[PDB]
Design an enzyme around this catalytic site. Structure first.
Site, short mmCIF file in Angstrom:
data_model
loop_
_atom_site.label_atom_id
_atom_site.label_comp_id
_atom_site.label_asym_id
_atom_site.label_seq_id
_atom_site.Cartn_x
_atom_site.Cartn_y
_atom_site.Cartn_z
N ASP A 121 2.80 -4.37 -1.39
CA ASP A 121 4.21 -3.96 -1.27
C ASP A 121 4.28 -2.44 -1.14
O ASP A 121 4.23 -1.70 -2.12
CB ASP A 121 5.01 -4.42 -2.51
N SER A 149 13.99 -1.76 -5.76
CA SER A 149 12.76 -1.69 -4.98
C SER A 149 12.71 -0.49 -4.04
O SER A 149 13.74 -0.01 -3.53
CB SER A 149 12.56 -2.97 -4.20
C1 2Z0 Z 1 12.91 -5.67 -3.48
C2 2Z0 Z 1 13.13 -5.06 -4.92
O1 2Z0 Z 1 14.45 -4.53 -5.17
C3 2Z0 Z 1 12.94 -6.10 -5.99
C4 2Z0 Z 1 12.55 -5.48 -7.33
C5 2Z0 Z 1 12.53 -6.46 -8.51
C6 2Z0 Z 1 12.24 -5.71 -9.77
N1 2Z0 Z 1 12.17 -6.56 -10.96
C7 2Z0 Z 1 11.77 -6.13 -12.15
N2 2Z0 Z 1 11.81 -6.95 -13.19
N3 2Z0 Z 1 11.38 -4.86 -12.32
N4 2Z0 Z 1 11.97 -7.10 -5.59
C8 2Z0 Z 1 12.17 -8.39 -5.83
O2 2Z0 Z 1 13.18 -8.85 -6.40
C9 2Z0 Z 1 11.07 -9.32 -5.36
N5 2Z0 Z 1 11.36 -10.65 -5.86
C10 2Z0 Z 1 11.26 -10.88 -7.15
O3 2Z0 Z 1 10.83 -10.05 -7.95
C11 2Z0 Z 1 11.61 -12.28 -7.61
C12 2Z0 Z 1 13.08 -12.32 -8.04
C13 2Z0 Z 1 13.62 -13.71 -8.33
C14 2Z0 Z 1 13.93 -13.92 -9.80
O4 2Z0 Z 1 15.08 -13.66 -10.21
O5 2Z0 Z 1 13.02 -14.37 -10.54
N6 2Z0 Z 1 10.73 -12.61 -8.72
S1 2Z0 Z 1 9.27 -13.11 -8.11
O6 2Z0 Z 1 8.39 -12.79 -9.36
O7 2Z0 Z 1 8.64 -12.58 -6.77
C15 2Z0 Z 1 9.53 -14.78 -8.02
C16 2Z0 Z 1 9.77 -15.26 -9.24
C17 2Z0 Z 1 10.02 -16.60 -9.45
C18 2Z0 Z 1 10.28 -17.08 -10.74
C19 2Z0 Z 1 10.53 -18.42 -10.92
C20 2Z0 Z 1 10.53 -19.31 -9.87
C21 2Z0 Z 1 10.29 -18.88 -8.59
N7 2Z0 Z 1 10.32 -19.95 -7.57
C22 2Z0 Z 1 11.42 -20.04 -6.65
C23 2Z0 Z 1 9.21 -20.93 -7.51
C24 2Z0 Z 1 10.03 -17.50 -8.35
C25 2Z0 Z 1 9.78 -17.00 -7.06
C26 2Z0 Z 1 9.53 -15.64 -6.89
#
Ligand code: 2Z0
Length: 265
Positions: free
Chosen positions: A109, A216
């Protein structure tokens, strides 16, 4: 030069951090993306200024495959949308994104944008727009090092809105032992990622510091050599402020060279 700033005790606590004047992190940048045929801007993400015409940001922030001339980089701004007086604006010349960004795991990233200016210089250094110091390749800050991140992102997961004022949050780099998939709902954690977050809890509910959606592309800086040094880029995480759950950042150090080569005149 870099890692310098006229800090000020932020005063306006927020669920997730605390309000802060852009002067405090003059390298914070707001990236606005427009929609289909000029209907208006939209807060897309944040940017870390590393040189007059080069801002670092998150790779996933550009999943959308935006047309270069569809992003605007704004610097020196305390309010997300309220035009700051000393603010500086620049159009995106071009922007690279890591050729291996694994969208499924936010692996790699990181992305770079180049500020469009008819000259080899764009952003003129000032008290509200200054560059951060990249980490020295050999840097390895101790466990739980006290660091601090900033942005214009949401104040908590489910909130439909972005912060109208630059929020700032202070966290601690985590030990390698805790920055692993076991600690992060089995999700994957590669060796270009680093965990850092708030260690407090217990007391009858608390507002833990942590970045959140909209944050982000923002920085996660640490003091090092009397200056502020970029250590990680805000990448991803389980919600926003969960107990015992760190946030995942990009190891700027690992991508030092990529950041280097990619700046070709
Ligand atoms: C692009 C940027 O603004 C953000 C920064 C997030 C910062 N978070 C922090 N705690 N410091 N980037 C994102 O949001 C990238 N996506 C995520 O981080 C997702 C957000 C979804 C959520 O609310 O959980 N989390 S993840 O870790 O990549 C992800 C988590 C998750 C948890 C449970 C179940 C699922 N699925 C749908 C199976 C997921 C999928 C992805």
């Amino acid at each position: 030069t870099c890692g310098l700033r006229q800090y000020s005790q932020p005063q306006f606590r927020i669920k997730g951090g605390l309000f802060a004047d852009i002067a405090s992190h003059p390298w914070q940048a707001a990236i606005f993306a427009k929609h289909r045929r000029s209907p208006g801007e939209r807060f897309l993400c944040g940017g870390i200024l590393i040189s007059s015409c080069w801002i670092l940001s998150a790779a996933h922030c550009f999943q959308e495959r935006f047309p270069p001339h569809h992003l605007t980089v704004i610097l020196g701004r305390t309010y997300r949308v309220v035009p700051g007086e000393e603010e500086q604006k620049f159009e995106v010349e071009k922007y690279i994104v890591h050729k291996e960004f694994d969208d499924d795991t936010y692996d790699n990233d990181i992305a770079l944008l180049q500020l469009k200016s008819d000259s080899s210089r764009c952003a003129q250094e000032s008290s509200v727009v200054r560059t951060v110091c990249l980490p020295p390749a050999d840097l390895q800050l101790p466990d739980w090092t006290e660091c601090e991140l900033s942005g214009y992102g949401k104040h908590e997961a489910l909130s439909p809105f972005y912060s109208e004022r630059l929020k700032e949050a202070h966290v601690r780099l985590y030990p390698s032992s805790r920055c692993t998939s076991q600690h992060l709902l089995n999700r994957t954690v590669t060796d270009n990622m680093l965990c850092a977050g708030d260690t407090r809890s217990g007391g009858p509910q608390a507002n833990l510091h942590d970045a959140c959606q909209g944050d982000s592309g923002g920085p996660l800086v640490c003091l090092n050599d009397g200056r502020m040094t970029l250590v990680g880029i805000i990448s991803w995480g389980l919600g926003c402020g969960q107990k015992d759950v760190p946030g995942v950042y990009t190891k700027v150090t690992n991508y030092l060279d990529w950041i280097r080569d990619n700046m070709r005149p």
